[PDB]
Ligand binder design. Structure first.
Ligand code: HEM
Ligand SMILES: O[C@H](C[C@H]1c2c(F)cccc2-c2cncn21)[C@H]1CC[C@H](O)CC1
Length: 375
């Protein structure tokens, strides 16, 4: 009773793909070579030609979901490398048909947009060095990078380690809703203290970012390859997916608003982050379309259950209010620390070279979390 079945949420890894596939069938060896040698092919300036000189491979040889997730990540990384190139200005506004058609095919099959997404580069872009050793940074590695010294391993692994840390709270969600219907007051308080404990533990995981991500490398390099073609001046009308669409289609770039973890606690605790017409709420709602289907289904199914904030508010129980508030406080702590990280990794490098609009969105989301406190 957690239903890792219907909503595809693993007990230890959570929204992450449990044990992602490292290699694709030999049929797709031409795809795998490009994706694995992206730093070299970009630096040498022969990535684009090597992509242009590909044959349209059929997505029919991708049998299981794991291989379909790998190919999504493989083609997603190739697309970002093709579009952005060296990342200095020369942008390709047309994705070749031999890449654009199979990518769009597999994208429709997995109900995800044809752009690199959080679920590709974080949830499915990992492996454990020794399978018998635990899930720790030191025992882990990413499958794909963009450039040498892009700090993508540190960026993707720390996001994943945070996502895994938060999974420990997702398994107590059924207990929260059942304790509410059965009116098991003490169980609900204990369940809320357990969620708060897990979110407090996930804050220490964030600390690891400083050890494996450099401000200059993230801002001047990594940031470029995660950028998309929705509201982007250097791709005004979007990107053309050759032989699939007639018109250039606009797709949003990489966003952690695509992480189901933070969105599900915002829903669970009844923090009005999606409710309203404002930019912040609209953006977070849009990013749900960039999540795997089972995961966006879990978020609306949580919305379909009675409110935890309203239940706690309906009772003159200080102990239940304190437990609920510990969860909210743990979320404000994560977002307050995250705002400090964004100052180091975006605000300062930008000053030594937009960023204010990103700061406003984050401060608003944090504000909304802060205002959800009962007191
Ligand atoms: C170098 C470190 C990091 C930087 C520079 C960074 C930057 C940003 C920026 C600029 C945003 C603005 C909105 C967007 O994504 O479109 C954002 C949002 C977000 N980031 Fe990070 N981030 C970092 C690390 C992390 C990590 C490790 C996580 C863990 C999962 C994370 C979780 C989030 C979440 C959940 C959001 C959505 C806003 C919210 O719900 O508060 N970020 N981040
Ligand atoms: O915030 C965006 C980046 C986004 C993101 C990925 F994309 C991939 C993996 C993890 C994360 C993450 C953590 N916290 C924010 N994120 C960033 C992308 C480039 C844009 O130009 C500016 C926003």
């Amino acid at each position: 009773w957690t239903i890792s079945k219907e909503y595809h949420i693993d007990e230890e890894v959570g929204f992450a793909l449990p044990n992602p596939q490292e290699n694709l069938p030999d049929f797709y060896n031409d795809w795998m070579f490009i994706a694995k040698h992206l730093p070299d092919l970009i630096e040498s300036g022969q990535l684009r030609e090597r992509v242009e000189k590909l044959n349209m491979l059929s997505i029919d040889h991708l049998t299981d979901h794991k291989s379909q997730r790998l190919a999504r990540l493989v083609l997603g990384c190739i697309t970002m490398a093709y579009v952005w190139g060296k990342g200095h200005g020369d942008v390709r506004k047309v994705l070749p048909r031999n890449i654009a058609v199979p990518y769009c095919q597999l994208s429709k099959k997995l109900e995800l947009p044809p752009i690199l997404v959080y679920a590709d580069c974080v949830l499915a872009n990992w492996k454990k060095k020794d399978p018998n050793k635990p899930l720790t940074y030191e025992n882990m590695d990413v499958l794909f990078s963009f450039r040498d010294g892009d700090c993508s391993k540190g960026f993707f692994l720390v996001s994943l380690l945070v996502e895994i840390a938060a999974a420990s709270a997702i398994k107590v969600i059924p207990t929260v809703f059942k304790a509410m219907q059965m009116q098991e007051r003490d169980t609900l308080l204990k369940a809320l203290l357990e969620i708060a404990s897990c979110l407090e533990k996930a804050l220490q995981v964030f600390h690891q970012i400083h050890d494996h991500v450099n401000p200059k490398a993230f801002f001047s390099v990594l940031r470029i390859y995660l950028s998309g073609w929705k509201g982007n001046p250097q791709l005004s009308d979007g990107l053309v997916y050759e032989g699939f669409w007639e018109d250039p289609k606009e797709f949003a770039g990489g966003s952690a608003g695509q992480s189901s973890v933070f969105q599900c606690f915002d829903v669970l605790l009844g923090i009005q982050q999606t409710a309203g017409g404002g930019h912040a709420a609209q953006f977070l709602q849009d990013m749900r379309r960039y999540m795997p289907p089972a995961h966006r289904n879990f978020l609306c199914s949580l919305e379909s259950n009675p409110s935890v904030r309203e239940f706690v508010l309906s009772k003159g129980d200080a102990g239940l209010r304190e437990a609920y508030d510990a969860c909210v406080k743990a979320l404000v702590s994560l977002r307050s620390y995250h705002l400090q990280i964004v100052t180091k990794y975006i605000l300062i490098p930008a000053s030594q070279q937009g960023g204010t609009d990103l700061m406003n969105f984050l401060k608003t989301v944090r504000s909304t979390t802060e205002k959800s406190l009962l007191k």
